[PDB]
Amino acid sequence: GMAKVKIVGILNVTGGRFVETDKAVVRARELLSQGADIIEIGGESTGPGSNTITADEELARIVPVIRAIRSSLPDANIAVDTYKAEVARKALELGATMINDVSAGRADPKLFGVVARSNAQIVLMYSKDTDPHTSFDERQYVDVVRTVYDFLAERKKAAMSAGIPADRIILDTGLGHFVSSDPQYSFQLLAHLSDFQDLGCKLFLSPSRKSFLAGNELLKTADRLPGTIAASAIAVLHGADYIRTHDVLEVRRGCEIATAINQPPER
Amino acid sequence: GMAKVKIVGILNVTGGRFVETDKAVVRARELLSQGADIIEIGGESTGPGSNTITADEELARIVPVIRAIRSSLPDANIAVDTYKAEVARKALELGATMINDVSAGRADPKLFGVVARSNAQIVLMYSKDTDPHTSFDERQYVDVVRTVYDFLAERKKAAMSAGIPADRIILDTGLGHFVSSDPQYSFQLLAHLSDFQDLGCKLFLSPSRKSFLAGNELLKTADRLPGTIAASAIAVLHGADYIRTHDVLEVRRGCEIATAINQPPER
Ligand SMILES: Nc1nc2ncc(CO)nc2c(=O)[nH]1
Ligand SMILES: Nc1nc2ncc(CO)nc2c(=O)[nH]1
Ligand SMILES: [Cl-]
Ligand SMILES: [Cl-]
């Protein structure tokens, strides 16, 4: 029996900041209602055009939300999106069990150790830039699969050297602008995702209505749900163990079909 | 450059039968608007519980609709779903360029010759039953891929013997109840669809909200669009050249993503 994918539901937190906390719990409950396995909280955007926020601002955004979710939804599994060691440290103390670092441990030399001194998992994503805030850039590649594979191999090596065992390391190839503002490279990584299973780590991907799904029609975000379903399903077909998404209900259901296709006949 | 899938939009025609014809043209135009490449007309259901209709009743349903579409939408490519030679013959005379036979040429010994004496393509579908009206039956298989492959090999041989060249033969493994009321076999055929490319024919499949997509939640038809998108996308990933669907807009868009994943890098 092949296990289904774990669905990671996005809960972004980016005078009146207390109005967000009650609404965050309502949103988290809806994500769980739709079948999310993990609620992913983040207080700092890192897409193109984003700017750096301080650790104090980042904590001020996510800590009230973590506390409220831990109190009202106590069995909910929490992940926190951060590249800052101080933020990861507080998140882990409050009960988060996953840290997702879009810098793959590069932005803060202390973050690996913080996670090493926990029982949390870390997600290491490939990005074409050193700055966790990714750029608009039509980066080309001779062989994006080789580039990303070797990058993730090296980041896994670094995470293990800092004390994180392989079984708490999750790898993400990146998709969309993190890989390139040219969409072809995201499709190539999805095509060859099974090659990354040789690194011995669970795989996490996030098609999530990214602009590489705009296609020939130049589809805006509201029109990218069919493409997000198709990409997330093929990612699972090709070895994804986690899918991060805003559309938990539909992507869970589409991924269940991928799992069923991967299921070998009766033995 | 890998070609995109051809989307086959379903237009079913199953006191006041003249009210259907004007509405059929409106529906056909919408299917084309959404990006269908072929409009598939049929006057006889063949799912579980369906009953046989006469050739005269079948023609009385589809001929006014074909004529109206040929007149109002003259560049639209028309396929007709029929297992009857007489019906196929009239459809071809009126300008249909595809005959889809859910009996794979078994139900009417004259149908192969009718298509041979045309420039139309024929779709040969596998079904577990000889009767084109398929049964409710949880048919089990030792190796459904072997069964279906050998069946389609033999039907291709028969079609060629009757005068239809390979390049006008399209093969469909069947899905849903045509294969089995047990869903596992539909998923297995999707998993192994590329094995059928050895038969040297274009491949046609129709996930189209069939009950094998009901999943663990026992989803009704209204809730099967994410699963239809995922299944149709993986079918294209695995070699489908045609996808037959009611949800042309969404399935076209999901399949475009599958095509992009199949697209090799710059050479
Ligand atoms: N691991 C991971 N994290 C992300 N965080 C933000 C965004 C924003 O688009 N994408 C991703 C992603 O693709 N993978
Ligand atoms: N070739 C083909 N024809 C069909 N006709 C009707 C239906 C009705 O569900 N399905 C199919 C199908 O899966 N393939
Ligand atoms: Cl610590
Ligand atoms: Cl004839």
Side-chain angles (χ1 to χ4, degrees):
Chain A
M2 183 66 75
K4 287 189 277 181
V5 78
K6 278 188 195 163
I7 298 289
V8 179
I10 301 164
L11 190 81
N12 287 324
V13 181
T14 58
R17 63 195 342 176
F18 290 80
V19 197
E20 253 265 354
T21 279
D22 315 79
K23 282 340 269 177
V25 172
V26 161
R27 305 193 263 140
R29 179 175 335 253
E30 179 59 23
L31 295 171
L32 294 173
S33 179
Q34 292 183 25
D37 297 293
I38 296 167
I39 301 301
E40 178 176 27
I41 301 176
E44 177 173 11
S45 308
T46 50
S50 57
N51 281 125
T52 304
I53 79 176
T54 69
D56 287 348
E57 184 53 26
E58 192 176 355
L59 289 158
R61 293 177 181 182
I62 71 168
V63 173
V65 169
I66 293 162
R67 293 187 180 279
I69 289 171
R70 295 288 303 115
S71 166
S72 300
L73 303 166
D75 320 310
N77 300 287
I78 293 179
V80 168
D81 278 24
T82 187
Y83 60 83
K84 303 194 182 74
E86 182 185 358
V87 180
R89 185 191 307 121
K90 183 55 136 173
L92 294 179
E93 293 167 355
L94 294 172
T97 52
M98 189 171 284
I99 299 297
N100 173 36
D101 180 356
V102 297
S103 83
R106 298 183 285 174
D108 190 333
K110 295 222 181 63
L111 184 141
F112 274 161
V114 162
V115 176
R117 299 182 295 273
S118 78
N119 64 4
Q121 303 193 86
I122 189 172
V123 185
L124 308 175
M125 215 196 51
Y126 167 82
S127 173
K128 67 192 195 304
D129 307 293
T130 52
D131 189 320
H133 311 89
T134 206
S135 63
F136 287 119
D137 177 10
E138 290 176 10
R139 179 81 38 100
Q140 301 296 305
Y141 296 89
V142 171
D143 182 348
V144 69
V145 174
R146 180 186 210 161
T147 295
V148 176
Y149 185 96
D150 289 342
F151 174 93
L152 290 171
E154 189 273 330
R155 307 303 312 141
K156 180 201 187 194
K157 183 182 165 191
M160 296 197 300
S161 171
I164 310 181
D167 83 315
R168 285 167 48 223
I169 295 166
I170 302 170
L171 306 175
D172 182 339
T173 60
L175 291 171
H177 292 290
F178 295 104
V179 173
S180 175
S181 300
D182 181 341
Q184 68 175 300
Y185 297 111
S186 292
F187 294 124
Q188 288 164 23
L189 287 166
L190 290 166
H192 291 282
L193 185 62
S194 70
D195 294 355
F196 294 82
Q197 291 182 305
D198 295 358
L199 293 173
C201 296
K202 296 182 296 294
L203 296 176
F204 177 121
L205 275 198
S206 189
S208 64
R209 301 197 191 221
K210 285 175 162 66
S211 73
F212 79 98
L213 298 168
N216 274 14
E217 286 171 288
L218 301 182
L219 297 172
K220 303 332 185 338
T221 292
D223 290 327
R224 289 176 198 158
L225 180 55
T228 300
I229 291 167
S232 297
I234 291 167
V236 170
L237 194 78
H238 287 178
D241 303 298
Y242 300 84
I243 289 288
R244 168 184 181 279
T245 181
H246 331 92
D247 300 287
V248 166
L249 185 71
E250 297 90 347
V251 166
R252 174 176 65 73
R253 284 175 176 168
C255 288
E256 163 184 22
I257 295 314
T259 301
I261 290 166
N262 270 343
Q263 174 60 66
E266 286 153 11
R267 233 178 53 235
Chain B
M2 183 66 75
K4 287 189 277 181
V5 78
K6 278 188 195 163
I7 298 289
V8 179
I10 301 164
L11 190 81
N12 287 324
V13 181
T14 58
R17 63 195 342 176
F18 290 80
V19 197
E20 253 265 354
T21 279
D22 315 79
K23 282 340 269 177
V25 172
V26 161
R27 305 193 263 140
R29 179 175 335 253
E30 179 59 23
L31 295 171
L32 294 173
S33 179
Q34 292 183 25
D37 297 293
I38 296 167
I39 301 301
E40 178 176 27
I41 301 176
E44 177 173 11
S45 308
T46 50
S50 57
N51 281 125
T52 304
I53 79 176
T54 69
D56 287 348
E57 184 53 26
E58 192 176 355
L59 289 158
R61 293 177 181 182
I62 71 168
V63 173
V65 169
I66 293 162
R67 293 187 180 279
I69 289 171
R70 295 288 303 115
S71 166
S72 300
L73 303 166
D75 320 310
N77 300 287
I78 293 179
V80 168
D81 278 24
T82 187
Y83 60 83
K84 303 194 182 74
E86 182 185 358
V87 180
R89 185 191 307 121
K90 183 55 136 173
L92 294 179
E93 293 167 355
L94 294 172
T97 52
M98 189 171 284
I99 299 297
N100 173 36
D101 180 356
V102 297
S103 83
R106 298 183 285 174
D108 190 333
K110 295 222 181 63
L111 184 141
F112 274 161
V114 162
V115 176
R117 299 182 295 273
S118 78
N119 64 4
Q121 303 193 86
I122 189 172
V123 185
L124 308 175
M125 215 196 51
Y126 167 82
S127 173
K128 67 192 195 304
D129 307 293
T130 52
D131 189 320
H133 311 89
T134 206
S135 63
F136 287 119
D137 177 10
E138 290 176 10
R139 179 81 38 100
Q140 301 296 305
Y141 296 89
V142 171
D143 182 348
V144 69
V145 174
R146 180 186 210 161
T147 295
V148 176
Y149 185 96
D150 289 342
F151 174 93
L152 290 171
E154 189 273 330
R155 307 303 312 141
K156 180 201 187 194
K157 183 182 165 191
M160 296 197 300
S161 171
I164 310 181
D167 83 315
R168 285 167 48 223
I169 295 166
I170 302 170
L171 306 175
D172 182 339
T173 60
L175 291 171
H177 292 290
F178 295 104
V179 173
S180 175
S181 300
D182 181 341
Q184 68 175 300
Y185 297 111
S186 292
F187 294 124
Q188 288 164 23
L189 287 166
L190 290 166
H192 291 282
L193 185 62
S194 70
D195 294 355
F196 294 82
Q197 291 182 305
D198 295 358
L199 293 173
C201 296
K202 296 182 296 294
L203 296 176
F204 177 121
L205 275 198
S206 189
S208 64
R209 301 197 191 221
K210 285 175 162 66
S211 73
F212 79 98
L213 298 168
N216 274 14
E217 286 171 288
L218 301 182
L219 297 172
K220 303 332 185 338
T221 292
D223 290 327
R224 289 176 198 158
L225 180 55
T228 300
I229 291 167
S232 297
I234 291 167
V236 170
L237 194 78
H238 287 178
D241 303 298
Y242 300 84
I243 289 288
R244 168 184 181 279
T245 181
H246 331 92
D247 300 287
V248 166
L249 185 71
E250 297 90 347
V251 166
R252 174 176 65 73
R253 284 175 176 168
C255 288
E256 163 184 22
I257 295 314
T259 301
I261 290 166
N262 270 343
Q263 174 60 66
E266 286 153 11
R267 233 178 53 235

